[PDB]
Design a protein around this ligand. Structure first.
Ligand SMILES: Nc1ncnc2c1ncn2[C@@H]1O[C@H](COP(=O)(O)OP(=O)(O)O)[C@@H](O)[C@H]1O
Ligand SMILES: Nc1ncnc2c1ncn2[C@@H]1O[C@H](COP(=O)(O)OP(=O)(O)O)[C@@H](O)[C@H]1O
Ligand SMILES: [Mg+2]
Ligand SMILES: [Mg+2]
Lengths: 165, 481, 524, 31
């Protein structure tokens, strides 16, 4: 129940008020602005808070009204995992990596999906099936339609002639 | 306003002179004519540098302060020191004030501008990255001068600064649709004659017809007030051709150290505490306001070559060290390189250029130029090993690097066209295409069988193979005898 | 901005370029210390100035800032009675600004004079800051909130390595949550004006202006602005720090700031000491750099990372201004002149360089590879001075890999270093390491019709970057899949691509090989 | 190496004495 920071002062474990702020999300960059505001008011992110953020990254469109160049919900998502694991010292539970698998199949990035089901199967000993077949569907979708890799880069036999740009 | 406002000389300590005004002091940088008669042959004009109180202002004398009594009548001009501008200045010689010093009648002027202009803002700046082919091997290859560039020739006493400026006037300033300005800042009065005559012979300055040069001289004989301000006088004339007429222009400041040194004299007498190595505390600020005016605007384009004296061959000295930050192509001349036989005495490792870049110059230019710098860096490391161990102790591949690198140092030398009297040989304008190809082949090892002294003091590859033919023929005759 | 007048404190007495002294008006109001004052140059216009001396006489020493040509003796002087505040926020980004706050054409305020975070306010530096250089990010790793000095001679790459560090953030910042985005603040103290313009265009072309603001006090502008320019730079960064975000501050350079402060001090008769600098020239840089910090979890956990540049004259670290800044900062990145001309660019002297909080600052993946590299390069440098060992082979390839113009992406760097660590570039010669590295990143030989069959790990998929940062390369998830990619790349490169070097011994093919290999040095 | 380093160190200290005596002998002339 009780918790202390690095110095040993008392810390606000009352997470639930800040969770409902993250649910009213709209665009996922606003979730980070809330995560800042908790830390500012001596209230470190809970394990449930990170999962509540991960939900908002999946559901909404990107940063805000205007689009940013080279948007990546996965890269924003995997940064947040790096924050909780290494720095804050919190192991992400089964809910954490299931949100990651959803975004791979939703956006269509199946190649990431192959890597993260290997992750989800190992260590955390769980195979969620639902998304595995949806991920494997997108893998076969790339093969049968045309080609899976970039395509123009792969086929072109280089050997001495390679463009530097 | 304040047009003919009368004042009296409060105190005279050297070139620095205080002036008391009854109805308040004029503004700063305001020129003042000394009306009082005295036994003078030439007039006296004071520029206000500081204010002491509401009624008193400290100044600096542009002419000598001899015969100046206390309480002498002094009158304002209207504003700053004013200098004539436009095409009527071309062909004529001037002093710091803008009076013609060549005895060829009155100038046609029709407008005068103040010496102390403000430097362009950020919005006025513009970059035009094109190579200015100087026709010199060490410059064009390793530290190429760009169009619109501020260029500096750093070196100690008697290394080839004045020689390189004269060669650039031959190589670049003659075949140029723009005009040119020469700031003779605190240098030899006798060197000024030789420039004036040689330009008259070559017809860049023309008496009867069209002229394409302006001369503004404030030489060693003049007091510090003139030698300080004379750099700005020339810069005002170049600023007219840049801003008003909208044109590509050349500026030639020999020497920019003499500006800083001239300010170092007055700054002591003005009562400022000196900074490092006895220079003025405003050393960086003095160069700041001067050098920032020298730049390529949206309206026109100054392309300034400058000479920089390195005092006591100490490059860490404030006067050059502060200047280095302002420049686009920094040319560094070394004494040991001069005394070894290599002219021009350019030490290529301490040199640098902004346009030494694959984007601006060609890919073949950059790659060849870098290999010369790389090979010379390896050669300096190998030179320490041969002194300790010996020439025979080196490896098989390293011996071949020494043979090429020795030829690279010799091939970097060049007989200048202005320096026919010194070298005793005719000059060589080496083309940019010739410079890149000849050095490229030397790095490949296509000229390994060519002897070393063939490369010493010649132009491009045709002159190398010509000298190598003469060496083969004369060596064949002496061997037969 | 247009500052707020209050009371007419005095008249202008003397001027000496960019410094002045005042006489108090009847009544002797007395202005407060370190405050801005507006001098009426005309009825319509004002000219700002900072108060530096409050003499016993009643006279007040002023450092002139704006409209210095228009200042005259006998002019009226209005006081603000406040410290210098400037425009700060997200709205200031992508613009050039003075130390006073006026925008250069080409938001709640914050105090420039502010105390640094105390003992309990800070925390240990854990978040990494990627410069985008294999030489730096392994051996001299910079953490967020750290002060890392950049020292070396003119034209050694002091600005470029600082500017490319700002450009390296755009690839991350675009992809990541804006909470963890590295907002940059390039301060240009005493530089040439066109140099600021070229950096503006260079920042604009790489999309850096979105996540960057440019503080600018050029050589034309007075010593008062140059003195105050780094302070205005940190103020803009502290906004992001105090509001739980990470920031970067480049001062280019503190050498020219000190010269500007010396001018101010000497002109106002402050007693000079070593190399004519005042007594408090150490205090000048100390209170600047200490405001850069890593805050605690209790105050947002934000940061201001500092990259102060300091020019040395002919590799002389014994100079007073250089020795001062070294004793303040958390180690340095020394740029040697001989390494620059020798070939190695960036010319990072690893023996002279040091990071005082390196290990804790690095990423978990980067800590794995870099710990071994210290052991290899230590033995390589010793054996090079005093027959090729495994350390001698692999050590030489690292030196070839450290050469780069533009900054490398974290994935593309760590994989090419991991290859050299486990010894995938041993059979590959030293001259063909950049051609090997280019074909690894942009192209791929396994997919180049044949022996591919990897389920997830490829180099074209840039999104694996963040999975590597979490799990590391030495891990059961990625270890076996990575070692396939490298085995396919080496065997095919040695067989198909390196076979040409035994062949090509002719004119127009040796030159074609060179021009290929020289372009490979630029692109990592 | 010992004796040249000592001369570097003597020149370092003698330089800073001579630097500051000149600089502060300036402001004795200026009061
Ligand atoms: N390119 C060159 N060719 C021949 N002699 C040169 C060259 N450059 C310099 N010198 C020698 O240097 C001497 C003086 O050089 P100068 O440029 O007048 O001095 P500074 O470098 O102080 O301006 C001359 O006597 C001349 O012999
Ligand atoms: N990593 C690098 N690779 C290649 N060239 C570089 C590199 N860093 C700097 N340079 C070049 O060196 C020159 C000087 O760089 P700069 O950053 O201005 O150094 P300084 O700040 O020390 O003057 C520039 O022309 C630039 O192109
Ligand atoms: Mg000379
Ligand atoms: Mg720089």
């Amino acid at each position: 129940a009780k918790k202390y920071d690095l110095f040993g002062y008392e810390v606000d474990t009352n997470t639930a008020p800040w969770i409902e702020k993250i649910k009213k999300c709209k665009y996922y960059d606003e979730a980070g602005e809330v995560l800042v505001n908790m830390n500012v008011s001596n209230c470190p992110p809970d394990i449930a808070t990170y999962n509540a953020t991960l939900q908002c990254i999946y559901q909404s469109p990107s940063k805000q009204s205007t689009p940013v160049d080279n948007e990546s919900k996965f890269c924003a998502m995997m940064d947040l995992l790096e924050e909780m694991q290494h720095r804050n010292r919190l192991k992400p539970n089964e809910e954490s990596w299931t949100w990651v698998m959803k975004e791979c199949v939703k956006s269509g990035q199946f190649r990431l999906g192959y890597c993260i089901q290997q992750v989800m199967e190992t260590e955390c000993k769980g195979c969620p099936a639902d998304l595995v077949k949806a991920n494997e569907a997108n893998a076969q979708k790339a093969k049968t339609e045309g080609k899976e890799h970039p395509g123009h880069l792969s086929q072109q036999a280089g050997l001495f002639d390679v463009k530097v740009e | 306003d304040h047009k003919g406002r009368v004042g009296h000389v409060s105190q005279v300590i050297g070139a620095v002179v205080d002036v008391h005004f009854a109805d308040g002091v004029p503004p700063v940088l305001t020129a003042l004519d000394v009306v009082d008669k005295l036994g003078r042959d030439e007039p006296l004009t004071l520029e206000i540098v500081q204010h002491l109180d509401a009624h008193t202002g400290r100044c600096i004398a542009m002419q000598t302060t001899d015969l100046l009594k206390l309480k002498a009548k002094v009158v304002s001009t209207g504003g700053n020191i004013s200098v004539p501008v436009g095409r009527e200045t071309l062909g004529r010689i001037f002093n710091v004030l803008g009076d013609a010093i060549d005895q060829r009648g009155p100038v046609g002027e029709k407008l005068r501008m103040p010496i102390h202009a403000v430097a362009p803002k950020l919005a006025d700046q513009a970059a035009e990255d094109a190579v200015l082919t100087t026709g010199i091997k060490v410059i064009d290859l390793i530290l190429p001068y760009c169009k619109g560039g501020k260029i500096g020739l750093f070196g100690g006493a008697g290394v080839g600064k004045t020689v390189i400026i004269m060669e650039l006037i031959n190589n670049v300033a003659k075949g140029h649709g723009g005009f040119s300005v020469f700031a003779g800042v605190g240098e030899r009065t006798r060197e000024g004659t030789d420039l004036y005559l040689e330009m008259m012979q070559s017809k860049v300055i023309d008496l009867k017809g069209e002229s394409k040069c302006v001369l503004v001289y404030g030489q060693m004989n003049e007091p510090p007030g003139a030698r300080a301000r004379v750099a700005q006088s020339a810069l005002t004339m170049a600023e007219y051709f840049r801003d008003v007429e909208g044109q590509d222009v050349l500026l030639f400041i020999d020497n920019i150290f003499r500006f800083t040194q001239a300010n170092s004299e007055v700054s002591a007498l003005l009562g400022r505490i000196p900074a490092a190595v006895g220079y003025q505390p405003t050393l960086a600020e003095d160069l700041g306001q001067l050098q920032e005016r020298i730049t390529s605007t949206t309206k026109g384009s100054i392309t300034s070559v400058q000479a920089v004296y390195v005092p006591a061959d100490d490059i860490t000295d404030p006067a050059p060290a502060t200047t280095f930050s302002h420049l686009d192509a920094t040319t560094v001349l070394d004494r040991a390189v001069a005394e070894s036989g290599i002219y021009p005495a350019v030490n290529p490792l301490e040199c640098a250029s902004r346009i030494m870049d694959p984007d601006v110059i060609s890919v073949d230019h950059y790659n060849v130029a870098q290999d010369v710098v790389q090979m010379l860096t390896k050669y300096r490391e190998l030179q320490d090993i041969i002194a300790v161990l010996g020439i025979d102790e080196l490896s098989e591949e390293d011996k071949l690097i020494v043979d090429r690198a020795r030829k690279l140092v010799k091939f970097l030398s060049q007989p200048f066209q202005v320096a026919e009297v010194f070298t005793g040989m005719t000059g060589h304008y080496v083309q940019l295409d010739d410079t890149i190809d000849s050095f490229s082949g030397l790095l490949m090892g296509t000229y390994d069988q060519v002897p070393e002294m063939a490369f010493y003091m010649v132009g491009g590859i045709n002159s190398v193979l010509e000298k190598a033919k003469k060496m083969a023929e004369e060596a064949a005759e002496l061997e037969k005898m | 901005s247009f500052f707020k007048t209050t009371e007419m404190i005095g008249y202008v007495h003397s001027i000496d370029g960019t410094i002045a002294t005042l006489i108090p008006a009847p009544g002797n109001p007395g202005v407060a210390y370190n405050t801005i004052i507006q001098i009426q140059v005309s009825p319509t216009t004002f000219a700002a100035g900072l108060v530096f001396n409050l003499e016993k006489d009643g006279r007040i020493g002023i450092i002139l800032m704006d409209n210095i040509t228009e200042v005259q003796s006998g002019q009226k002087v209005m006081a603000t009675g406040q410290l210098l505040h400037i425009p700060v926020g997200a709205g200031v980004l992508g613009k050039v600004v003075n130390p006073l706050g006026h925008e250069v054409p080409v938001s709640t305020l914050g105090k420039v004079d502010t105390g640094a975070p105390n003992i309990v306010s800070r925390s240990p530096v854990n978040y990494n800051l990627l410069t985008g250089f294999k030489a730096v990010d392994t051996m001299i790793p910079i953490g967020r909130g750290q002060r890392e000095l950049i020292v070396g001679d003119r034209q050694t790459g002091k600005t470029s390595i600082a500017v490319s560090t700002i450009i390296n953030q755009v690839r991350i910042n675009q992809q990541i949550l804006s909470k963890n985005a590295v907002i940059s603040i390039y301060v240009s103290i005493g530089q040439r004006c066109s140099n600021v313009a070229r950096i503006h265009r260079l920042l604009q072309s790489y999309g850096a202006l979105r996540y960057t603001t440019v503080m600018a006090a050029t050589a034309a502008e007075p010593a008062g602005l140059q003195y105050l320019a780094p302070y205005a730079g940190v103020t803009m960064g502290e906004y992001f720090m105090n509001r739980g975000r990470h920031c970067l501050c480049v001062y280019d350079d503190l050498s020219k700031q000190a010269v500007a402060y010396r001018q101010i001090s000497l002109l106002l008769r402050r007693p000079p000491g070593r190399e004519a600098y005042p007594g408090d020239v150490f205090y000048l840089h100390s209170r600047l750099l200490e405001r850069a910090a890593m805050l605690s979890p209790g105050k947002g956990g934000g940061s201001v990372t500092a990259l102060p540049i300091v020019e040395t004259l002919s590799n002389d670290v014994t100079a007073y201004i250089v020795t001062n800044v070294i004793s303040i900062t958390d180690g340095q990145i020394y740029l040697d002149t001989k390494l620059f001309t020798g070939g190695q660019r960036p010319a990072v002297n690893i023996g002279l360089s040091v990071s005082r909080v390196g290990s804790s600052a690095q990423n978990a993946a980067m800590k794995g590879v870099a710990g071994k590299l210290k052991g290899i390069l230590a033995e390589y440098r010793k054996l090079a001075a005093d027959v090729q060992t495994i350390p001698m082979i692999r050590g030489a390839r690292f030196v070839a890999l450290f050469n780069q113009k533009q900054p490398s992406y974290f994935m593309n760097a760590i994989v090419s270093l991991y290859a050299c660590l486990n010894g995938y570039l041993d059979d590959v010669k030293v001259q063909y390491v950049k051609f090997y590295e280019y074909l690894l990143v942009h192209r791929d030989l396994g997919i180049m019709y044949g022996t591919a069959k990897n389920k997830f790990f490829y180099m074209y998929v840039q999104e694996l970057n963040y999975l590597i940062r979490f799990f590391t390369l030495n891990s059961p998830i990625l270890h076996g899949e990575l070692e396939e990619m490298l085995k396919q790349h080496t065997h095919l490169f040695l067989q198909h691509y390196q076979s040409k070097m035994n062949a090509i011994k002719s004119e127009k093919d040796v030159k074609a090989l060179k021009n290929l290999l020289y372009s490979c040095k630029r692109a990592v | 190496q010992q004796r040249t380093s000592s001369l570097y160190n003597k020149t370092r200290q003698f330089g800073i004495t001579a630097a500051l005596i000149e600089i502060l002998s300036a402001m004795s002339s200026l009061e």
